[PDB]
């Protein structure tokens, strides 16, 4: 299967509290494995997965230094950005960065990521060619010119094609079946009275991994959404996920409806009825 090494970085300015808050988190696929928080009792990079304790101290020290350099950079960039947009009322502003690599099951670099958003919207992003930049507005054209003449695209190309893929393969080796896992959902249907004319049927899928899943309701063989409620896929807290899908059906006719669960861990889709 395809895999991803991603870092999600957030920097938030704090009027009156001095230095901005800086948070960086790392994910291998759907699993967080490292963290950095400037407000911790402990501004260091630390593990968040049970298979990351086998890296030595030098790993963590290097990660920490790179983190701090990035924090410094974001400290500058927040000020720069409030200048570019002529924001005069001060206030808290947000700068986000996502970077990393998506590889195929054949370890092809599907996508190298190096992108930035300011105050909730796109600011600038490295394109898939890993050579050119996309700048969301005129302020980001300044930055784009700078990074063009400076050769940043090459700099991060080297990383995305090298270090990123390398260490992704390494993390996949360390975690192994805790990452390459496939947990089939545990599924069941519940029944809930509503009124004289209708009731609610709810299809539950619990404890599955990875997060990708699809639930469908059918009436004697054909799909419905004429009154279907579908919640967002949610983390259980133990590294697995949950989801449910409910439908309002006429009283007495509950036994005509079926739920269908589609997941990587289910060779054949599950068909359930109450």
């Amino acid at each position: 299967g395809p895999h991803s090494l991603r870092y999600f970085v957030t920097a938030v300015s704090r009027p009156g509290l001095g230095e901005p808050r800086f948070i960086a988190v790392g994910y291998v696929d759907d699993t967080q494995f490292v963290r950095f928080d400037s407000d911790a009792d402990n501004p260091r990079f630390e593990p968040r997965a049970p298979w990351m304790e086998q890296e030595g101290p030098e790993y963590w020290e290097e990660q920490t230094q790179r983190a701090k350099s990035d924090e410094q950079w974001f400290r500058v960039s927040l000020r720069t950005a409030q200048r570019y947009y002529n924001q005069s009322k001060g206030g808290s502003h947000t700068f986000q960065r996502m970077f990393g690599c998506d590889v195929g099951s054949d370890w092809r670099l599907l996508r190298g990521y190096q992108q930035f958003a300011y105050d909730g919207r796109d600011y600038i992003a490295l394109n898939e060619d890993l050579k050119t930049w996309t700048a969301a507005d005129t302020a980001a054209l300044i930055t784009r010119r700078k990074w063009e003449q400076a050769g940043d695209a090459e700099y991060y190309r080297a990383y995305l094609e090298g270090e990123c893929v390398e260490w992704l393969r390494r993390y996949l080796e360390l975690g192994n079946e805790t990452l390459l896992r496939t947990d089939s959902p545990k599924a069941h249907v519940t029944y809930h009275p509503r009124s004289q004319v209708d009731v609610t049927l709810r299809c539950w899928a619990l404890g599955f991994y990875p997060a990708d899943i699809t639930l469908t309701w059918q009436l004697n063989g054909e799909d419905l959404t004429q009154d279907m409620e579908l919640v967002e896929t949610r983390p259980a807290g133990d590294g697995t996920f949950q989801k449910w899908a409910a439908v309002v059906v006429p009283l007495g006719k509950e036994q005509n409806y079926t739920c269908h669960v589609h997941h990587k861990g289910l060779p054949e889709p599950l068909t359930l009825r109450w």
Binding site: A24, R66, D70, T80
Partner: peptide
């Protein structure tokens, strides 16, 4: 592995 230190300002 975190990306290398930035080389160009915003």
């Amino acid at each position: 592995f975190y990306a290398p230190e930035p080389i160009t300002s915003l």
